[PDB]
Amino acid sequence: MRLLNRHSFVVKRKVSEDGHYNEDGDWVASQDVVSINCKGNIQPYIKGSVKNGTQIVLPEGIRLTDTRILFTVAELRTSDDVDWTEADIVMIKGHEYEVFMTMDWSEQLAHTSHYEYIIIRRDKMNAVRN
Amino acid sequence: TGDPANNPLDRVRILCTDTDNNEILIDQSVLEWFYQESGKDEKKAAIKALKYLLFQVAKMGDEKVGGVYLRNSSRFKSLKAVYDDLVKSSVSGLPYAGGINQCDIDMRRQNPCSVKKYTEYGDAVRYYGR
Amino acid sequence: TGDPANNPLDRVRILCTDTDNNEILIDQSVLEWFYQESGKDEKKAAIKALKYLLFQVAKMGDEKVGGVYLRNSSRFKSLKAVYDDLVKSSVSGLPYAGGINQCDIDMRRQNPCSVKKYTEYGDAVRYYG
Amino acid sequence: TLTIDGKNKILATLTPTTIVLHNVDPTADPTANKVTQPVAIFFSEPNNGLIASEDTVNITVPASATVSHFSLWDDNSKCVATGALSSPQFFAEEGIYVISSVSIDLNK
Amino acid sequence: ELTVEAGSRVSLSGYVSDGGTSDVFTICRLLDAPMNGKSNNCNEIVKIPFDSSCLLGVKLYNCENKRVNVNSVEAAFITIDTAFQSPMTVNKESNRLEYIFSQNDYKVLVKGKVYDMIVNVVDESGNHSTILKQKVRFN
Amino acid sequence: APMNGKQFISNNCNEIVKIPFDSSCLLGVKLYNCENKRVNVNSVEAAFITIDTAF
C-alpha cells in the first residue's frame, strides 16, 4: 500500500498547447482542456513564509489562501515560456489549484523516483473571455 | 460493511479481522472470490482470507512520504505469533492410538493388503487360531 | 486487475498474493510467461510465480530519495517465514514404511536386478520356499 | 405505577374509529352539541403507551358553526376520550376542518 | 395498604383548511447524483431513523459538472434492493427528484439492514438509466 | 483519445471504466490529432466499438 498513491485528484492539462496572443493583443489560452484522474499524496507545506489555510484580513474582506505540497509519480508540468507550456490545475474539494515550482526526482532511484510539486489555490477573480 | 447480521460477506470480514475501512487490506473482490470457492461457507472463507492476509502483511514495508511515516516491519511478527496460538495450534480431530477398539482391529483384520503376523495379542486364548 | 471470476491471469495474482496494483512486483509479462509454461494451469503457475517473488524481494534494498523513504530490508525476513510455514512445510504426498503391504511385497519381488537375501520374513511357515 | 408492558396491552383495546366535533365541552354529556358527523379516524399500535393517527382527518364542518371541542368514539358507539380544540374555530361559511395529529397516552 | 396510580394526557393540533396542500416538512437527507460518475475511497452509509418519514433529495448534476433541471425525465423510480419499487416525484419547483418514505414501505423493511438505493430515470426516448447506487441503513 | 499514441500524462495507469448494469449509457470519445489538437469528426466516415467477446 504505497503512500505515494493515497489521494486521487483530477488534473486539467492544456493538452492542445496553443496559447497564442490574438490580433487585438489579449491572451487566448488553450481551447482544449482535458481532465484525467491522477494519484498522489497531498500534504500541507510547512516552511516559514508559506501560509497554509490562512485567512488574510484585507481592508476589502477576508481572503483565504493555502499552499500544499504534492508527491506523485505523474509528470505534471508548470507554465514555461520556452516550450509554450501552460501549467497544470489540480483539484481539491472543487477549488482549482496551480502547480507553481517543481522538483524533478524522475530518474534518481529505482522504486522511489517521484516528482514533488507545490500546488497553490487560485484566487477568486471575475472571468472574461478573449 | 457494517451489517454482520444480514450480510454474509460482512460476517466473513469479522472472522478475518479486516473490519477497518481506513486500512482495508483484503479487497472485496478478493474476499468475494474466497467466499464462492468455499461453497458459500463463511468459516472456510475466513481461513483462506487469514492465510492471504498473512502474505500481505509480510510484503508490507515502511514508507515515509513527506510528513507521514508508516512503520510496517513490526506488524507481521505480532500477527504471526497470534496466528499459531489461536489458529495453527487448535486440533480439531482425534489422535489415533495403537489397538484399543475391538472393532477397528477387526476392520483392519479384513484388509487383504497386509502382513500375516506370526502372533498378535489375544491369540492363545482363542481355540480357532487366526 | 479486479476480476477473479473471469480472468485466469488475475487468479494467479491472488494465489501469488500480488493483488496490489500500487506496489506491483511481478510484471504481467513475466506472469503471462509463467502461466503459459505451466500448461495454462493456475495452481502450478502460482508456485513458479511465488518463487520468483522471493528472488525479487531479496534483491531489493533500502532507498531514500529526498522526501520519500522506503525500508525494503525487513520484507524477506517476514516473507520467508510465511513461505516456509504455508508452502514448504506442507507435504504433497504419502510417506513410505517397510513391509506393511503384501501386494507391495510381491510387486517388489518381481524386480530381477535386486539382491537375493538369505532368509526373509515368512520363510518359516511356507511349504514351497 | 404501571409498566410500559402494562400500558401497551391497555391501549391495544381502545380502537377508536369515529371522531365528532363539539362547540362546548362534552364531558358531562357527549350526546350534546354534535356539531359534526362521525368520521373515520385510524390509530396505530401502542408504542411506549402512546398511539398516533396515520393520516389527516377531514371533518366536514357545517356553516355557521363554532367548533371548540373534541371527543372520540369507538366501534361500540360509546365515547372513550374527550379533549379541547386549543382554539375556538368559527366557520362562518361551510368549511373543511382538518385534524393533523391525535395522540392518546398515559405517560402521566 | 398499597395502591398504584396513573394518569392521562391528550393533545391535538389543527390547521383549519386554508385550501392549500398542507405544509409537509420532515427530512434532512439530500444526496448528490453526478451523471458522469464521481477520491473514490468508500461511500458513506445514508442513515434514516427507522419509522419516521424522510424525504430523499436527489440533485441532478449534468454530465460535465453542473446542476441541471429535472427535464426530459418523465418517470423516476426508487428501487431499494429486494424491498419495493415506487415511482418518485419529478419536482419542477425545487429542481430535485424526491421521494418521501411512508409507513407502508417500512412494513417490508428490517431495522439495520444495509439496502442499496438505485435510482432510474426514463426520458422521452424510453432509455432506462441508473443514476445513483447509494447504500442506505434504516437504524 | 490521442491518436499519436503518446499518453497525455505518462507514468499514470489507466482506470477501468465502471458503468452501472441495466443502464443505457452514452460512450463519448474525443479524438486528438498528432499535435494533440482536437479534430473535427468530419474526418471519420465510420467507426466501430469492440467489446472483445460481447459485440
PDB file of N, CA, C and O in Angstrom, chain B residues 27 29-30 33-34 51-52 54-66 69 72-73 76 80 83-84 88 112-119, chain C residues 2 4-5 11 14 17-19 25 50 53 67-71 74-75 78-79 81-82 85-87 99-103 121-125:
ATOM      1  N   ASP B  27      -9.194  -6.848  -0.434  1.00  0.00           N
ATOM      2  CA  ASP B  27     -10.190  -6.158  -1.240  1.00  0.00           C
ATOM      3  C   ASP B  27     -11.440  -7.025  -1.361  1.00  0.00           C
ATOM      4  O   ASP B  27     -11.377  -8.256  -1.318  1.00  0.00           O
ATOM      5  N   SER B  29     -13.253  -7.692  -3.847  1.00  0.00           N
ATOM      6  CA  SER B  29     -13.211  -8.589  -4.995  1.00  0.00           C
ATOM      7  C   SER B  29     -12.512  -9.896  -4.636  1.00  0.00           C
ATOM      8  O   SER B  29     -12.956 -10.983  -5.018  1.00  0.00           O
ATOM      9  N   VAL B  30     -11.406  -9.799  -3.897  1.00  0.00           N
ATOM     10  CA  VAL B  30     -10.705 -10.997  -3.441  1.00  0.00           C
ATOM     11  C   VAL B  30     -11.568 -11.765  -2.448  1.00  0.00           C
ATOM     12  O   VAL B  30     -11.695 -12.992  -2.522  1.00  0.00           O
ATOM     13  N   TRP B  33     -14.275 -13.667  -3.993  1.00  0.00           N
ATOM     14  CA  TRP B  33     -13.705 -14.831  -4.656  1.00  0.00           C
ATOM     15  C   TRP B  33     -13.540 -15.994  -3.683  1.00  0.00           C
ATOM     16  O   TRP B  33     -13.874 -17.141  -3.997  1.00  0.00           O
ATOM     17  N   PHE B  34     -13.020 -15.703  -2.490  1.00  0.00           N
ATOM     18  CA  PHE B  34     -12.825 -16.741  -1.482  1.00  0.00           C
ATOM     19  C   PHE B  34     -14.158 -17.293  -0.996  1.00  0.00           C
ATOM     20  O   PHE B  34     -14.288 -18.494  -0.728  1.00  0.00           O
ATOM     21  N   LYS B  51      -4.989 -16.632   5.757  1.00  0.00           N
ATOM     22  CA  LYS B  51      -3.731 -17.046   5.146  1.00  0.00           C
ATOM     23  C   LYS B  51      -3.279 -16.031   4.104  1.00  0.00           C
ATOM     24  O   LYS B  51      -2.094 -15.694   4.011  1.00  0.00           O
ATOM     25  N   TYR B  52      -4.223 -15.531   3.306  1.00  0.00           N
ATOM     26  CA  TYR B  52      -3.912 -14.488   2.336  1.00  0.00           C
ATOM     27  C   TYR B  52      -3.472 -13.215   3.051  1.00  0.00           C
ATOM     28  O   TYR B  52      -2.547 -12.524   2.612  1.00  0.00           O
ATOM     29  N   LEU B  54      -1.954 -13.005   5.899  1.00  0.00           N
ATOM     30  CA  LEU B  54      -0.596 -13.205   6.391  1.00  0.00           C
ATOM     31  C   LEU B  54       0.427 -12.877   5.314  1.00  0.00           C
ATOM     32  O   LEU B  54       1.471 -12.279   5.590  1.00  0.00           O
ATOM     33  N   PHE B  55       0.139 -13.273   4.074  1.00  0.00           N
ATOM     34  CA  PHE B  55       1.051 -12.987   2.972  1.00  0.00           C
ATOM     35  C   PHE B  55       1.183 -11.488   2.742  1.00  0.00           C
ATOM     36  O   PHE B  55       2.286 -10.976   2.521  1.00  0.00           O
ATOM     37  N   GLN B  56       0.062 -10.765   2.785  1.00  0.00           N
ATOM     38  CA  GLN B  56       0.083  -9.333   2.502  1.00  0.00           C
ATOM     39  C   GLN B  56       0.907  -8.575   3.534  1.00  0.00           C
ATOM     40  O   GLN B  56       1.704  -7.696   3.190  1.00  0.00           O
ATOM     41  N   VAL B  57       0.730  -8.907   4.814  1.00  0.00           N
ATOM     42  CA  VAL B  57       1.421  -8.175   5.872  1.00  0.00           C
ATOM     43  C   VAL B  57       2.927  -8.375   5.766  1.00  0.00           C
ATOM     44  O   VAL B  57       3.713  -7.463   6.045  1.00  0.00           O
ATOM     45  N   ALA B  58       3.350  -9.570   5.350  1.00  0.00           N
ATOM     46  CA  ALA B  58       4.778  -9.844   5.216  1.00  0.00           C
ATOM     47  C   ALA B  58       5.419  -8.951   4.162  1.00  0.00           C
ATOM     48  O   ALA B  58       6.538  -8.461   4.354  1.00  0.00           O
ATOM     49  N   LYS B  59       4.735  -8.726   3.049  1.00  0.00           N
ATOM     50  CA  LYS B  59       5.280  -7.937   1.947  1.00  0.00           C
ATOM     51  C   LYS B  59       5.270  -6.444   2.215  1.00  0.00           C
ATOM     52  O   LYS B  59       5.843  -5.697   1.413  1.00  0.00           O
ATOM     53  N   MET B  60       4.656  -5.971   3.294  1.00  0.00           N
ATOM     54  CA  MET B  60       4.484  -4.543   3.524  1.00  0.00           C
ATOM     55  C   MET B  60       5.687  -3.976   4.266  1.00  0.00           C
ATOM     56  O   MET B  60       6.050  -4.462   5.341  1.00  0.00           O
ATOM     57  N   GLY B  61       6.305  -2.946   3.680  1.00  0.00           N
ATOM     58  CA  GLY B  61       7.462  -2.303   4.259  1.00  0.00           C
ATOM     59  C   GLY B  61       7.167  -0.858   4.634  1.00  0.00           C
ATOM     60  O   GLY B  61       6.117  -0.300   4.299  1.00  0.00           O
ATOM     61  N   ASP B  62       8.122  -0.255   5.335  1.00  0.00           N
ATOM     62  CA  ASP B  62       7.955   1.104   5.825  1.00  0.00           C
ATOM     63  C   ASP B  62       7.968   2.105   4.676  1.00  0.00           C
ATOM     64  O   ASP B  62       8.666   1.930   3.678  1.00  0.00           O
ATOM     65  N   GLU B  63       7.174   3.162   4.827  1.00  0.00           N
ATOM     66  CA  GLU B  63       7.064   4.216   3.830  1.00  0.00           C
ATOM     67  C   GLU B  63       7.054   5.567   4.530  1.00  0.00           C
ATOM     68  O   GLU B  63       6.435   5.719   5.587  1.00  0.00           O
ATOM     69  N   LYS B  64       7.747   6.552   3.938  1.00  0.00           N
ATOM     70  CA  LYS B  64       7.822   7.904   4.502  1.00  0.00           C
ATOM     71  C   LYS B  64       7.696   8.912   3.363  1.00  0.00           C
ATOM     72  O   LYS B  64       8.679   9.283   2.724  1.00  0.00           O
ATOM     73  N   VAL B  65       6.473   9.374   3.119  1.00  0.00           N
ATOM     74  CA  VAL B  65       6.241  10.390   2.101  1.00  0.00           C
ATOM     75  C   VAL B  65       6.011  11.738   2.766  1.00  0.00           C
ATOM     76  O   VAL B  65       4.897  12.045   3.205  1.00  0.00           O
ATOM     77  N   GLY B  66       7.057  12.553   2.837  1.00  0.00           N
ATOM     78  CA  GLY B  66       6.953  13.865   3.441  1.00  0.00           C
ATOM     79  C   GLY B  66       6.750  13.816   4.940  1.00  0.00           C
ATOM     80  O   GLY B  66       7.651  13.414   5.682  1.00  0.00           O
ATOM     81  N   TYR B  69       4.984   8.897   8.176  1.00  0.00           N
ATOM     82  CA  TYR B  69       5.924   7.781   8.225  1.00  0.00           C
ATOM     83  C   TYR B  69       5.195   6.596   8.836  1.00  0.00           C
ATOM     84  O   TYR B  69       4.813   6.642  10.008  1.00  0.00           O
ATOM     85  N   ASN B  72       5.927  -0.593   9.149  1.00  0.00           N
ATOM     86  CA  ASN B  72       5.178  -1.829   8.963  1.00  0.00           C
ATOM     87  C   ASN B  72       6.010  -3.073   9.239  1.00  0.00           C
ATOM     88  O   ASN B  72       5.529  -4.195   9.030  1.00  0.00           O
ATOM     89  N   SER B  73       7.245  -2.909   9.703  1.00  0.00           N
ATOM     90  CA  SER B  73       8.132  -4.038   9.936  1.00  0.00           C
ATOM     91  C   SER B  73       7.816  -4.795  11.218  1.00  0.00           C
ATOM     92  O   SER B  73       8.336  -5.899  11.408  1.00  0.00           O
ATOM     93  N   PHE B  76       3.934  -7.907  11.090  1.00  0.00           N
ATOM     94  CA  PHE B  76       3.902  -9.341  10.834  1.00  0.00           C
ATOM     95  C   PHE B  76       4.190 -10.156  12.086  1.00  0.00           C
ATOM     96  O   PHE B  76       3.464 -11.106  12.391  1.00  0.00           O
ATOM     97  N   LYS B  80       1.883 -12.915  13.349  1.00  0.00           N
ATOM     98  CA  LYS B  80       2.294 -14.312  13.253  1.00  0.00           C
ATOM     99  C   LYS B  80       2.103 -15.033  14.581  1.00  0.00           C
ATOM    100  O   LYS B  80       1.527 -16.123  14.630  1.00  0.00           O
ATOM    101  N   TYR B  83      -1.370 -15.937  15.308  1.00  0.00           N
ATOM    102  CA  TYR B  83      -1.909 -16.924  14.381  1.00  0.00           C
ATOM    103  C   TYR B  83      -1.701 -18.355  14.863  1.00  0.00           C
ATOM    104  O   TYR B  83      -2.647 -19.148  14.914  1.00  0.00           O
ATOM    105  N   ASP B  84      -0.464 -18.707  15.216  1.00  0.00           N
ATOM    106  CA  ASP B  84      -0.182 -20.063  15.674  1.00  0.00           C
ATOM    107  C   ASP B  84      -0.921 -20.385  16.964  1.00  0.00           C
ATOM    108  O   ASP B  84      -1.473 -21.479  17.109  1.00  0.00           O
ATOM    109  N   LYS B  88      -3.335 -22.104  14.310  1.00  0.00           N
ATOM    110  CA  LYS B  88      -2.495 -23.183  13.804  1.00  0.00           C
ATOM    111  C   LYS B  88      -2.302 -24.284  14.840  1.00  0.00           C
ATOM    112  O   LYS B  88      -1.897 -25.399  14.500  1.00  0.00           O
ATOM    113  N   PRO B 112      -7.107 -57.115   2.747  1.00  0.00           N
ATOM    114  CA  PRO B 112      -6.231 -58.123   2.132  1.00  0.00           C
ATOM    115  C   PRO B 112      -4.772 -57.699   2.070  1.00  0.00           C
ATOM    116  O   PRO B 112      -3.871 -58.525   2.247  1.00  0.00           O
ATOM    117  N   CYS B 113      -4.530 -56.415   1.818  1.00  0.00           N
ATOM    118  CA  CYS B 113      -3.168 -55.913   1.693  1.00  0.00           C
ATOM    119  C   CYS B 113      -2.560 -55.675   3.067  1.00  0.00           C
ATOM    120  O   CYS B 113      -2.565 -54.547   3.570  1.00  0.00           O
ATOM    121  N   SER B 114      -2.035 -56.733   3.681  1.00  0.00           N
ATOM    122  CA  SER B 114      -1.401 -56.626   4.988  1.00  0.00           C
ATOM    123  C   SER B 114      -0.280 -57.648   5.102  1.00  0.00           C
ATOM    124  O   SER B 114       0.154 -58.211   4.094  1.00  0.00           O
ATOM    125  N   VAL B 115       0.197 -57.894   6.318  1.00  0.00           N
ATOM    126  CA  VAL B 115       1.254 -58.871   6.552  1.00  0.00           C
ATOM    127  C   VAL B 115       0.744 -59.892   7.557  1.00  0.00           C
ATOM    128  O   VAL B 115       0.182 -59.521   8.594  1.00  0.00           O
ATOM    129  N   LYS B 116       0.922 -61.173   7.248  1.00  0.00           N
ATOM    130  CA  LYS B 116       0.462 -62.233   8.132  1.00  0.00           C
ATOM    131  C   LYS B 116       1.372 -62.319   9.347  1.00  0.00           C
ATOM    132  O   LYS B 116       2.417 -62.976   9.304  1.00  0.00           O
ATOM    133  N   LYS B 117       0.987 -61.653  10.431  1.00  0.00           N
ATOM    134  CA  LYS B 117       1.798 -61.654  11.637  1.00  0.00           C
ATOM    135  C   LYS B 117       1.864 -63.053  12.229  1.00  0.00           C
ATOM    136  O   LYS B 117       0.869 -63.782  12.254  1.00  0.00           O
ATOM    137  N   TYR B 118       3.053 -63.432  12.702  1.00  0.00           N
ATOM    138  CA  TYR B 118       3.207 -64.739  13.327  1.00  0.00           C
ATOM    139  C   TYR B 118       2.348 -64.854  14.578  1.00  0.00           C
ATOM    140  O   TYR B 118       1.748 -65.903  14.830  1.00  0.00           O
ATOM    141  N   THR B 119       2.289 -63.792  15.378  1.00  0.00           N
ATOM    142  CA  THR B 119       1.484 -63.778  16.592  1.00  0.00           C
ATOM    143  C   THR B 119       1.111 -62.348  16.950  1.00  0.00           C
ATOM    144  O   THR B 119       1.933 -61.438  16.812  1.00  0.00           O
TER     145      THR B 119
ATOM    146  N   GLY C   2      -8.755  -6.754 -10.775  1.00  0.00           N
ATOM    147  CA  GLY C   2     -10.012  -6.517 -10.100  1.00  0.00           C
ATOM    148  C   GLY C   2     -11.012  -7.649 -10.229  1.00  0.00           C
ATOM    149  O   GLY C   2     -11.892  -7.785  -9.371  1.00  0.00           O
ATOM    150  N   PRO C   4     -11.579 -11.634 -10.303  1.00  0.00           N
ATOM    151  CA  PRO C   4     -11.094 -13.010 -10.171  1.00  0.00           C
ATOM    152  C   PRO C   4     -12.005 -14.062 -10.778  1.00  0.00           C
ATOM    153  O   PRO C   4     -11.572 -15.211 -10.928  1.00  0.00           O
ATOM    154  N   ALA C   5     -13.239 -13.710 -11.128  1.00  0.00           N
ATOM    155  CA  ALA C   5     -14.199 -14.693 -11.607  1.00  0.00           C
ATOM    156  C   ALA C   5     -13.994 -15.054 -13.072  1.00  0.00           C
ATOM    157  O   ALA C   5     -14.218 -16.206 -13.460  1.00  0.00           O
ATOM    158  N   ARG C  11      -6.369 -14.528 -11.342  1.00  0.00           N
ATOM    159  CA  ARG C  11      -6.453 -15.583 -10.338  1.00  0.00           C
ATOM    160  C   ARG C  11      -5.062 -15.997  -9.878  1.00  0.00           C
ATOM    161  O   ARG C  11      -4.847 -16.318  -8.705  1.00  0.00           O
ATOM    162  N   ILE C  14      -3.913 -13.666  -7.230  1.00  0.00           N
ATOM    163  CA  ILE C  14      -4.487 -13.931  -5.915  1.00  0.00           C
ATOM    164  C   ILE C  14      -3.685 -15.021  -5.218  1.00  0.00           C
ATOM    165  O   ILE C  14      -3.310 -14.880  -4.048  1.00  0.00           O
ATOM    166  N   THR C  17      -0.440 -13.801  -4.345  1.00  0.00           N
ATOM    167  CA  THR C  17      -0.657 -12.631  -3.482  1.00  0.00           C
ATOM    168  C   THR C  17       0.113 -11.401  -3.969  1.00  0.00           C
ATOM    169  O   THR C  17       0.925 -10.811  -3.255  1.00  0.00           O
ATOM    170  N   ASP C  18      -0.167 -11.015  -5.216  1.00  0.00           N
ATOM    171  CA  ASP C  18       0.335  -9.760  -5.763  1.00  0.00           C
ATOM    172  C   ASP C  18      -0.818  -8.859  -6.199  1.00  0.00           C
ATOM    173  O   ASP C  18      -0.691  -8.120  -7.180  1.00  0.00           O
ATOM    174  N   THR C  19      -1.950  -8.922  -5.502  1.00  0.00           N
ATOM    175  CA  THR C  19      -3.104  -8.101  -5.839  1.00  0.00           C
ATOM    176  C   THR C  19      -3.016  -6.742  -5.162  1.00  0.00           C
ATOM    177  O   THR C  19      -3.766  -6.460  -4.223  1.00  0.00           O
ATOM    178  N   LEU C  25       5.132  -6.128  -8.102  1.00  0.00           N
ATOM    179  CA  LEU C  25       6.484  -6.662  -8.171  1.00  0.00           C
ATOM    180  C   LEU C  25       6.662  -7.707  -9.260  1.00  0.00           C
ATOM    181  O   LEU C  25       7.781  -7.895  -9.745  1.00  0.00           O
ATOM    182  N   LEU C  50       5.511 -17.512  -7.134  1.00  0.00           N
ATOM    183  CA  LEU C  50       5.843 -17.238  -5.739  1.00  0.00           C
ATOM    184  C   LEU C  50       7.345 -17.318  -5.502  1.00  0.00           C
ATOM    185  O   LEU C  50       7.917 -16.493  -4.782  1.00  0.00           O
ATOM    186  N   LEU C  53       8.832 -14.228  -6.864  1.00  0.00           N
ATOM    187  CA  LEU C  53       8.607 -13.089  -5.982  1.00  0.00           C
ATOM    188  C   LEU C  53       9.648 -13.043  -4.871  1.00  0.00           C
ATOM    189  O   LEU C  53      10.110 -11.967  -4.478  1.00  0.00           O
ATOM    190  N   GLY C  67      12.734  13.290   0.401  1.00  0.00           N
ATOM    191  CA  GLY C  67      11.310  13.403   0.644  1.00  0.00           C
ATOM    192  C   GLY C  67      10.602  12.080   0.850  1.00  0.00           C
ATOM    193  O   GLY C  67       9.640  12.007   1.617  1.00  0.00           O
ATOM    194  N   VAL C  68      11.060  11.025   0.177  1.00  0.00           N
ATOM    195  CA  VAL C  68      10.414   9.719   0.232  1.00  0.00           C
ATOM    196  C   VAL C  68      11.419   8.677   0.702  1.00  0.00           C
ATOM    197  O   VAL C  68      12.571   8.664   0.259  1.00  0.00           O
ATOM    198  N   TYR C  69      10.976   7.802   1.602  1.00  0.00           N
ATOM    199  CA  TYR C  69      11.820   6.768   2.177  1.00  0.00           C
ATOM    200  C   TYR C  69      11.085   5.438   2.097  1.00  0.00           C
ATOM    201  O   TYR C  69       9.853   5.393   2.118  1.00  0.00           O
ATOM    202  N   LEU C  70      11.854   4.348   1.993  1.00  0.00           N
ATOM    203  CA  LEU C  70      11.272   3.023   1.769  1.00  0.00           C
ATOM    204  C   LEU C  70      12.242   1.974   2.318  1.00  0.00           C
ATOM    205  O   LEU C  70      13.294   1.690   1.742  1.00  0.00           O
ATOM    206  N   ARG C  71      11.881   1.385   3.457  1.00  0.00           N
ATOM    207  CA  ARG C  71      12.701   0.316   4.011  1.00  0.00           C
ATOM    208  C   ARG C  71      12.264  -1.034   3.463  1.00  0.00           C
ATOM    209  O   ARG C  71      11.211  -1.557   3.841  1.00  0.00           O
ATOM    210  N   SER C  74      13.387  -5.284   5.842  1.00  0.00           N
ATOM    211  CA  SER C  74      12.600  -6.215   6.641  1.00  0.00           C
ATOM    212  C   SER C  74      11.372  -6.711   5.889  1.00  0.00           C
ATOM    213  O   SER C  74      10.250  -6.615   6.397  1.00  0.00           O
ATOM    214  N   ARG C  75      11.568  -7.243   4.686  1.00  0.00           N
ATOM    215  CA  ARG C  75      10.466  -7.854   3.953  1.00  0.00           C
ATOM    216  C   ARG C  75      10.738  -9.331   3.706  1.00  0.00           C
ATOM    217  O   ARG C  75       9.846 -10.166   3.889  1.00  0.00           O
ATOM    218  N   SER C  78      10.277 -11.388   6.820  1.00  0.00           N
ATOM    219  CA  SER C  78       8.858 -11.643   7.058  1.00  0.00           C
ATOM    220  C   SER C  78       8.288 -12.594   6.009  1.00  0.00           C
ATOM    221  O   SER C  78       7.529 -13.512   6.334  1.00  0.00           O
ATOM    222  N   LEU C  79       8.639 -12.379   4.742  1.00  0.00           N
ATOM    223  CA  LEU C  79       8.101 -13.176   3.646  1.00  0.00           C
ATOM    224  C   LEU C  79       8.532 -14.633   3.729  1.00  0.00           C
ATOM    225  O   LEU C  79       7.731 -15.536   3.467  1.00  0.00           O
ATOM    226  N   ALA C  81       9.309 -16.464   6.348  1.00  0.00           N
ATOM    227  CA  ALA C  81       8.642 -17.174   7.433  1.00  0.00           C
ATOM    228  C   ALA C  81       7.272 -17.683   7.005  1.00  0.00           C
ATOM    229  O   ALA C  81       6.892 -18.820   7.309  1.00  0.00           O
ATOM    230  N   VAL C  82       6.512 -16.846   6.297  1.00  0.00           N
ATOM    231  CA  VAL C  82       5.224 -17.280   5.759  1.00  0.00           C
ATOM    232  C   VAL C  82       5.432 -18.377   4.723  1.00  0.00           C
ATOM    233  O   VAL C  82       4.719 -19.387   4.703  1.00  0.00           O
ATOM    234  N   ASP C  85       6.274 -21.730   6.228  1.00  0.00           N
ATOM    235  CA  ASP C  85       5.168 -22.248   7.025  1.00  0.00           C
ATOM    236  C   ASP C  85       4.021 -22.720   6.138  1.00  0.00           C
ATOM    237  O   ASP C  85       3.518 -23.837   6.304  1.00  0.00           O
ATOM    238  N   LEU C  86       3.603 -21.896   5.180  1.00  0.00           N
ATOM    239  CA  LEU C  86       2.390 -22.154   4.418  1.00  0.00           C
ATOM    240  C   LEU C  86       2.637 -22.866   3.096  1.00  0.00           C
ATOM    241  O   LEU C  86       1.678 -23.345   2.483  1.00  0.00           O
ATOM    242  N   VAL C  87       3.882 -22.953   2.636  1.00  0.00           N
ATOM    243  CA  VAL C  87       4.147 -23.559   1.336  1.00  0.00           C
ATOM    244  C   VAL C  87       5.102 -24.736   1.481  1.00  0.00           C
ATOM    245  O   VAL C  87       4.765 -25.868   1.115  1.00  0.00           O
ATOM    246  N   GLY C  99       7.786 -53.291   5.308  1.00  0.00           N
ATOM    247  CA  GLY C  99       6.979 -54.438   4.944  1.00  0.00           C
ATOM    248  C   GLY C  99       5.597 -54.408   5.562  1.00  0.00           C
ATOM    249  O   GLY C  99       5.302 -55.180   6.476  1.00  0.00           O
ATOM    250  N   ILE C 100       4.745 -53.515   5.070  1.00  0.00           N
ATOM    251  CA  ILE C 100       3.407 -53.342   5.614  1.00  0.00           C
ATOM    252  C   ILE C 100       2.330 -53.602   4.558  1.00  0.00           C
ATOM    253  O   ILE C 100       1.157 -53.316   4.792  1.00  0.00           O
ATOM    254  N   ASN C 101       2.705 -54.147   3.399  1.00  0.00           N
ATOM    255  CA  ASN C 101       1.735 -54.359   2.326  1.00  0.00           C
ATOM    256  C   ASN C 101       2.224 -55.563   1.518  1.00  0.00           C
ATOM    257  O   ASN C 101       3.292 -55.504   0.903  1.00  0.00           O
ATOM    258  N   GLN C 102       1.434 -56.640   1.530  1.00  0.00           N
ATOM    259  CA  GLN C 102       1.806 -57.848   0.801  1.00  0.00           C
ATOM    260  C   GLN C 102       1.816 -57.618  -0.704  1.00  0.00           C
ATOM    261  O   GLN C 102       2.691 -58.129  -1.411  1.00  0.00           O
ATOM    262  N   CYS C 103       0.837 -56.871  -1.219  1.00  0.00           N
ATOM    263  CA  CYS C 103       0.790 -56.599  -2.651  1.00  0.00           C
ATOM    264  C   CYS C 103       2.032 -55.835  -3.096  1.00  0.00           C
ATOM    265  O   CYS C 103       2.577 -56.081  -4.177  1.00  0.00           O
ATOM    266  N   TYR C 121      11.258 -62.733   5.852  1.00  0.00           N
ATOM    267  CA  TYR C 121      10.060 -62.906   6.661  1.00  0.00           C
ATOM    268  C   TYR C 121       9.082 -63.846   5.973  1.00  0.00           C
ATOM    269  O   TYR C 121       8.782 -63.693   4.787  1.00  0.00           O
ATOM    270  N   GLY C 122       8.587 -64.822   6.724  1.00  0.00           N
ATOM    271  CA  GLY C 122       7.592 -65.727   6.192  1.00  0.00           C
ATOM    272  C   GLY C 122       8.167 -67.061   5.770  1.00  0.00           C
ATOM    273  O   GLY C 122       7.429 -68.036   5.611  1.00  0.00           O
ATOM    274  N   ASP C 123       9.485 -67.123   5.587  1.00  0.00           N
ATOM    275  CA  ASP C 123      10.117 -68.370   5.174  1.00  0.00           C
ATOM    276  C   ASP C 123      10.339 -69.282   6.370  1.00  0.00           C
ATOM    277  O   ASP C 123      11.450 -69.774   6.591  1.00  0.00           O
ATOM    278  N   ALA C 124       9.282 -69.511   7.146  1.00  0.00           N
ATOM    279  CA  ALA C 124       9.318 -70.464   8.245  1.00  0.00           C
ATOM    280  C   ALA C 124       8.039 -71.290   8.248  1.00  0.00           C
ATOM    281  O   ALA C 124       7.985 -72.365   8.852  1.00  0.00           O
ATOM    282  N   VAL C 125       7.005 -70.791   7.574  1.00  0.00           N
ATOM    283  CA  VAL C 125       5.709 -71.449   7.521  1.00  0.00           C
ATOM    284  C   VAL C 125       5.225 -71.616   6.081  1.00  0.00           C
ATOM    285  O   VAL C 125       4.035 -71.778   5.843  1.00  0.00           O
TER     286      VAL C 125
END
